[PDB]
Design an enzyme around this catalytic site. Structure first.
Site, PDB file in Angstrom:
ATOM      1  N   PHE A  27      43.957   6.127  15.350  1.00 36.33           N
ATOM      2  CA  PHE A  27      42.811   6.874  14.724  1.00 36.33           C
ATOM      3  C   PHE A  27      42.685   7.009  13.198  1.00 36.33           C
ATOM      4  O   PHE A  27      42.177   6.088  12.522  1.00 36.33           O
ATOM      5  CB  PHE A  27      42.621   8.273  15.373  1.00 36.33           C
ATOM      6  CG  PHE A  27      42.223   8.208  16.812  1.00 36.33           C
ATOM      7  CD1 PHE A  27      40.968   7.757  17.165  1.00 36.33           C
ATOM      8  CD2 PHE A  27      43.130   8.495  17.800  1.00 36.33           C
ATOM      9  CE1 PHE A  27      40.616   7.595  18.477  1.00 36.33           C
ATOM     10  CE2 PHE A  27      42.792   8.339  19.115  1.00 36.33           C
ATOM     11  CZ  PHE A  27      41.526   7.881  19.461  1.00 36.33           C
ATOM     12  N   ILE A  28      43.025   8.214  12.712  1.00 30.91           N
ATOM     13  CA  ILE A  28      43.012   8.574  11.285  1.00 30.91           C
ATOM     14  C   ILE A  28      44.443   8.437  10.738  1.00 30.91           C
ATOM     15  O   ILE A  28      45.137   9.446  10.493  1.00 30.91           O
ATOM     16  CB  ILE A  28      42.533  10.017  11.076  1.00 30.91           C
ATOM     17  CG1 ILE A  28      41.534  10.414  12.182  1.00 30.91           C
ATOM     18  CG2 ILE A  28      41.936  10.144   9.699  1.00 30.91           C
ATOM     19  CD1 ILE A  28      40.095  10.543  11.761  1.00 30.91           C
ATOM     20  N   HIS A  29      44.887   7.179  10.629  1.00 31.97           N
ATOM     21  CA  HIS A  29      46.205   6.807  10.132  1.00 31.97           C
ATOM     22  C   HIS A  29      46.064   6.106   8.769  1.00 31.97           C
ATOM     23  O   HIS A  29      45.178   5.259   8.586  1.00 31.97           O
ATOM     24  CB  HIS A  29      46.901   5.868  11.143  1.00 31.97           C
ATOM     25  CG  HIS A  29      48.136   5.205  10.611  1.00 31.97           C
ATOM     26  ND1 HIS A  29      48.124   4.370   9.503  1.00 31.97           N
ATOM     27  CD2 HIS A  29      49.430   5.265  11.007  1.00 31.97           C
ATOM     28  CE1 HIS A  29      49.346   3.959   9.243  1.00 31.97           C
ATOM     29  NE2 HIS A  29      50.165   4.488  10.144  1.00 31.97           N
ATOM     30  N   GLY A  30      46.946   6.457   7.827  1.00 38.36           N
ATOM     31  CA  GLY A  30      46.943   5.838   6.510  1.00 38.36           C
ATOM     32  C   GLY A  30      45.616   5.758   5.777  1.00 38.36           C
ATOM     33  O   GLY A  30      44.675   6.498   6.075  1.00 38.36           O
TER      34      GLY A  30
ATOM     35  N   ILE B  83      43.667   3.178   5.852  1.00 38.77           N
ATOM     36  CA  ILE B  83      42.789   2.262   6.554  1.00 38.77           C
ATOM     37  C   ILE B  83      41.348   2.767   6.740  1.00 38.77           C
ATOM     38  O   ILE B  83      40.402   2.244   6.144  1.00 38.77           O
ATOM     39  CB  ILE B  83      43.352   1.906   7.946  1.00 38.77           C
ATOM     40  CG1 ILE B  83      44.846   1.577   7.862  1.00 38.77           C
ATOM     41  CG2 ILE B  83      42.611   0.703   8.526  1.00 38.77           C
ATOM     42  CD1 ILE B  83      45.183   0.154   7.416  1.00 38.77           C
TER      43      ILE B  83
END
Lengths: 161, 161, 161
Positions: free
Chosen positions: B12-15, B17
């Site tokens: 999902f809302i990682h790093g 990205i």
């Protein structure tokens, strides 16, 4: 509960506007009061997700607000309420929560609305409620920031009808 | 509603990205579409709590997304959808929401999955759905960032079976 | 699930306190465990809205925590639990979640509470539960920050009764 500002604003947590009111009153929390927004999962989240940190935020209904306003947990707490329109403010007062003044911030135009000021657009239901609000003695003010001079909304609305 | 990117991503809302996709398309909101995540209180919150500010985020089900996509409130709104897998994308299209392209980002490996690329791992149900997606004419692309060159996922998946 | 710290704190996500524990244990998520807070819409949001980014946060009940602790999804995950009081910690252990140590942080004074330390105030139900916790062999420590020296809460509480 100590209510420092009751504000009407269709767009909610937009730009630096709300933050400025907060720094000025030093409020602990921002509460959005609206029955529609409280039962709409895609809108409760989406509204409270762009609110500033160091500030607790939540969205409740006219009924829970009424209940919370009087609860002992939030005794002495300093808050700022956000409203989509003037009827829910009326609905909230008919639940026993005294609101001294209301800061009219904005009600976005639509095809079935009547533009009254650069930022406020009303319907027929909106106007009745703004009336009822002056009847309950609620001061109605118009301004975006704590630095804009306070204009009288009542005089402005009347010059229109 | 203007859907600028439909993305598959297990994490999902990682790093940085997702933020990069956002700055690039200039989207107002991020919506996670998944029935499981929408009914799971410990996961809806936990997903939407690490999303960037200045961006509204919310998690809805395939059914509400369908309803919201057509609602007049969000008319013209610019959004980016996040999906856990390719079936919910199929489920969403069978509700009347046209999705032109899908950006495959990642599907974490598990013991019962088959690794297909450094970041995508699929099951049997996943593959059928990626098929159905090319059947509905949906372009399927592979890449993490707006700067990685777009690889074709279909050719990649086929070379595997 | 790997529970790195179980903490009692009436005020929750206040100041830099919690952040310091996090940086120190390198936890992925913060979970508030409380039945009251999980069913109270105005309080679940309002608690999880001042938590730090780069950290997933969510509020669940003693029942869902029990279920999540054992779920395979969060296998290996590193978490830190927040509690309002010592009974819900007892309730959580009677659901099969082993908690080795508990860090007593603060329980705000009230008129019907008995102040025990600069920051902890207890009722009769609180004391029974702190007892039961030493009975289940749970180490009970007192301190705000990872840098304050660990004081023994048990010895402190006993010297009071």
């Amino acid at each position: 509960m100590n209510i420092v500002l009751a504000r009407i604003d269709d767009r909610f947590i937009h730009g630096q506007i709300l933050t400025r009111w907060i720094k000025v009153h030093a409020a602990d929390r921002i509460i959005v009061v609206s029955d529609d927004i409280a039962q709409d999962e895609m809108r409760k989240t989406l509204i409270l997700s762009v609110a500033p940190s160091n500030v607790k935020a939540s969205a409740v209904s006219v009924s829970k607000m009424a209940k919370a306003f009087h609860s002992p947990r939030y005794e002495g707490v300093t808050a700022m309420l956000l409203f989509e329109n003037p009827s829910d403010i009326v609905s909230l007062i008919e639940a026993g929560v005294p609101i001294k003044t209301v800061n009219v911030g904005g009600m976005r135009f639509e095809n079935h609305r009547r533009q009254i000021t650069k930022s406020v657009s009303v319907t027929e239901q909106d106007i009745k409620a703004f009336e009822t609000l002056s009847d309950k003695g609620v001061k109605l003010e118009l301004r975006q920031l704590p630095s804009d001079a306070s204009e009288d909304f009542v005089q402005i609305l009347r010059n229109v009808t």
